[model samples]
Target chain A: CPLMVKVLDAVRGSPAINVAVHVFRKAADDTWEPFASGKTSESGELHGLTTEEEFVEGIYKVEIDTKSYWKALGISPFHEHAEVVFTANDSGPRRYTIAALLSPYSYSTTAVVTNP
Target chain B: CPLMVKVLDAVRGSPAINVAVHVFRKAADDTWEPFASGKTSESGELHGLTTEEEFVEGIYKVEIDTKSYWKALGISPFHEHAEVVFTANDSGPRRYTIAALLSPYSYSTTAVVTN
Candidate 1:
């Protein structure tokens, strides 16, 4: 039930803006802990999260650090963060990938996994 | 007239695949040249093309190397590449950003420029 995730910057009017992601997982008791972190490139993409060995099966959430990314450009962000929660049922091989698109004011994400 | 662009991998059933992009610009004579190159991350994203300093205005195309990216995983790709064309009329400061999303079967891109 491993999870793979990716995040992108999808703001239509703002390019070259900075964006970052912080991953957290919900434990069996509904607690959360730091899972992984990275920043989007100038083109507003943050990929290469699969190689990380910590990806596991469970309920997980991703937090887009929009504030710091916009502050670097001397602009104020209308939305401070974007969060997504997803679950990976233990059904197939413990492997999956999730990707997200982010912009100054909008974002989207999806999970990719093998079907048994 | 500078152009900013980004590419992402958006194929659903397949994840952890590698995707790369090669940017080319069309000259006055309709010729093209290598502009910029980068690979998508494991999450299928390619960013950070702005600080390159070589960005300029004009007609540009992005060529996604789907074959190589899929080959790394020992799979055959239905399409060989994904290409996008865009024009930046000299209307504003030469600052912009482009982003793209790529998957095993499909992809998308857009230009973020100051309006």
Candidate 2:
């Protein structure tokens, strides 16, 4: 697998479905370039939006658009965007899964290394 | 104004727009009964809902539906609902406001009594 992801709605105890997540790669010019993005499915899972070669062992960012989600619930978001900053395998390309836990006030993200 | 409300996104530093909010009053049986509901506007505000006369000066609940909002952002919600519980008025029916601060993981609510 090249890339995989999922989102969880903490209180609901179920998949956080139909939410948008985006990817960015650290550029040589010290700017983050958009890599890929996708919406979550009913099971809080994602389609493979990025390819294997996209994993260049430097630095990358996966940011969850928290504002959109919190706003939908009719609540002002006290906390904003949830993100994961991580590096790929320095030796070679690796399979990664991006996981996020989201709530009305906070969020957490992880880049999991898995078998290709 | 009868009733006023607002929502905000902390990270966006702006109104939490286009969200669903609901109102409920505690019933005699101790169950929450729906009173009114509306969606937040671009300004994260609400129409004048629930009149002053409707303010019976009892226990009431105002809840923000955060699941739908978070889903719109393509993120799972860690916090499910935001709610404010308070007494309307001890003296008499008074103007009130419901304000909520929300994020993906936490929420805070305030029931502001106004003139």
Candidate 3:
């Protein structure tokens, strides 16, 4: 696998379970074309969003469904949604890790990229 | 101001300089009302976004101009911009710190709140 996501719940200091993640590739005309999507497991991790071969070099956007995640806990979040968009594997094949921390009122996301 | 922001540049491993920050408050009808705005200083920190008296309990959104920050360095980055929206000072008076890490193609943000 070349892409993955790790989500944490800041308020609970625990893994964010069942958070939905949607991956999209930017089209030539600046439109977003959906590539893959999944939900975080009990461990707050989701792997195999895309295979190495299928994950080519391009601009990709990862949208985390944070509104629903917090709403289920009976809290109203702030943002409409949380998203991270970036260029991937520009030079060569690389593994990408997106780590996000979620709070009812705030959220943070970071990326760790390395050669596979 | 009860609200502040600290921004970092991951690529240079230094303070993100002169980045713009916009602060907005949620209105009664779910619309965003402009509260205040500023730019990060040489230290990658911006204080006085709002005063303690003016920052009442409500939802607030902070928008960081990341695209211009990277583009100014001759790099074409992803994302239209980076933003953080959260509620503040529900129980009592408090201070909020927004720490953001910026990369050409990636970025991260976290909040540290205290009374």
Best by TM-score: 3
What TM-score against the true fold does each predicted structure earn? 0.40, 0.49, 0.66
Worst 10 residues of 2 chain A by lDDT: A102-111
Model 3, runs deviating above 4 Å? B1-15, B20-81, B85-107, B110-115
Between 2 and 3, whose TM-score is larger?
Answer: 3
lDDT of 1 by residue, B11-111 (tens): 33233335667878898889887777777666555666544345555777878776677577665555687777877556644555666554444455566
Cα lDDT for residue A56, model 3?
Answer: 90
lDDT, residue B76, candidate 3: 70
Clashes of 3: 0
Candidate 3 B-chain TM-score: 0.96
Chain A only: TM-score of every candidate?
Answer: 0.65, 0.88, 0.96
Chain B TM-scores per candidate, in order, are 0.65, 0.89, 0.96
> Candidate 2: which stretches are off by over 4 Å?
A1-116
DockQ for all models: 0.02, 0.06, 0.29
Q: Which should have the higher TM-score, number 1 or number 2? A: 2
